[model samples]
Target: NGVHHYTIDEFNYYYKPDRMTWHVGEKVELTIDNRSQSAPPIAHQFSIGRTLVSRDNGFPKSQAIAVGWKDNFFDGVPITSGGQTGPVPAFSVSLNGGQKYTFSFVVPNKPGKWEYGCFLQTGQAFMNGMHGILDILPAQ
Candidate 1:
C-alpha cells in the first residue's frame, strides 16, 4: 500500500477532487495534513462512512444522517461515546491550525456511495463548507 496525502486548508475545504472514486478491497494510506491558518483558530475534523449526504447549508434533507452506518472506514479513531449526536461518522480525525494526522484502511468490500466530512463546528462545518463524496466502485 502506498501513502497518498490529503491537505486541509481554508480553501478547498480539505479534499482534492472532493469527489473521489475507489474500488472495493483497496488498501491505501491516507495522510492528512492541516495547512489551515490559525489566526481565526479553526479546528478541523475528518470522518468516513457509507451513507447518503442528505443536507447542506443549514438545511435539513432526507437520509442525511450517518446512523445506519455500522462499520469503520479508517482506523485509530475514537468513537463518540455519550449522548446521541447528530450524524457523526464512526472513524474520525481532529487537527489544529498546523497539525498532521494519518489514517490507513482498506475500502469496505461493499461497493456504493459514501462520504468523508469535517464535523468541526458541528453542522456548520459541514453546511458552511466541509464535506466530500466517495464513490466506491465494485472490485474486479
Candidate 2:
C-alpha cells in the first residue's frame, strides 16, 4: 500500500490542519512543525487518545490525560520520530519552537475519532485550545 503523507503546523495557540483523517492499516507519515512564536518560546506536544478532561481549568474542563486508547488510532503502534524510533510507548511527543518532528506508523485496525493536544505548561496549551482531532476510517 502507498504511504500517506501529511504535515501539521503548531502555532502559538493552535494547530494548522488541526483535523486529519486516515484509513485503518495505512502506512502514514506525518511531519509536525512547531512554529509557535510565543515569547521565550514554548514547547508543544502531539498526543492522540481519548481525553478524560479530568482536570478543572478556569473555564470548566481540560484534556489533562488519556483515560484510555480504546478509541485511540495510534496506541501500541510502532512509531519513529527524530533520533528515536520504537513502539510508541507513550501517546505524546513534545517539541520546542522552530523544531520539527517527523513520525511514521502503520495505522492500527482501530477506526474512530481520537483527541490530540499539547498538554504542556501544566495544561495551559490545551486550555488555550491547542488541541486537535484525528479520525481513522475503517479499511474498505
Candidate 3:
C-alpha cells in the first residue's frame, strides 16, 4: 500500500523488521539501507524469491531458479543454473559497504513464505541465518 523502508547490516544477517508480511500483486517502493559498519565495506546481494530456495542445501541444479537479482554488475545466483542467464534484467541492484539503494517491485503473485537473502557466500552467510522470510498473503 505504500513505501517500505528497511535496513540490513552487512554480514550481520538482519533485516530492519526481520519478519514481515506482504500481499501478492501489491507494488511498493522498497528502500533498503545496506549498513556496512565494516572497515573493509563488505559486499551484499539482496534478492527475493517465492520459494524458500537455496543452492547450498542440495537444491536441484536442473530446477534451480531465480526470481530476480539485486546486483547491477552481478545478479546473484547460488549457481550458474540457479541464477538468471543471458541479458540480465535491468531491475537488479547491489550495495557495497555503507551504501544504500532503493527500488520497487511487485510482491510475487504466488503467495507463500518466501525468502530474502544475500546470495554471496551463502553457504556461510545464509547458513549462518543471513536471511528472512516474507509471509506473503494472497491478494484480497
Candidate 2 per-residue lDDT, tens place, 32-126, comes to 88998878777888777774444544564334432323334455788876677778656666789888878898888878888777767766777
1 or 2, greater by TM-score: 2
The CA lDDT of each predicted structure is 0.56, 0.76, 0.54
Provide the TM-score for each candidate, comma-separated. 0.64, 0.82, 0.62
RMSD of each: 7.6, 3.6, 8.7
Off by over 4 Å in 3: 1-11, 50-92
TM-score of 2: 0.82
lDDT of 3 at 9: 43
In the range 61-95, model 1's lDDT, one tens digit per residue, is 65353322234454333222244323334556777
Q: Looking at candidate 3, what is the lDDT of residue 99?
A: 75
In lDDT terms, which candidate is top? 2
Cα lDDT of model 3 by residue, 96-117, tens digit? 7677665545555556665676
